[PDB]
RNA sequence: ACACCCAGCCGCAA
């Protein structure tokens, strides 16, 4: 794609199904800067 | 550490920090529960 | 100057 060559080797190309995943990253990402804190050990709570 | 003080006699009773109490939005940890019970069954037997 | 209490149960990710 960039330089306009020709690959030495050659590709397997083809359809086939994918799926995506209930797993997104917007979900799983998180980040924590003396935010609230337990009641009760007086430390970071539990959860994103 | 002494033989007599080997038998629990006067029962200390943890501050609220142990057992912090929190409104909904008073409710009463477990281990206040079981204190409120052992005083009341105290002044049952005195 | 923030607001949401906790135990249990279950699914699921590496």
Do not use: C
């Amino acid at each position: 794609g960039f330089t306009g060559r020709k690959i030495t080797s050659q590709i397997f190309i083809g359809p086939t199904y994918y799926q995506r995943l209930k797993h997104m990253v917007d979900d799983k990402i998180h980040s924590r800067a003396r935010g609230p804190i337990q009641i009760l050990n007086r430390q970071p709570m539990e959860g994103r | 550490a002494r033989p007599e003080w080997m038998i629990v006699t006067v029962l200390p009773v943890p501050p609220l920090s142990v057992r912090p109490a929190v409104v909904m939005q008073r409710n009463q940890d477990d281990l206040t529960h079981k204190l409120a019970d052992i005083v009341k069954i105290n002044n049952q037997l005195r």
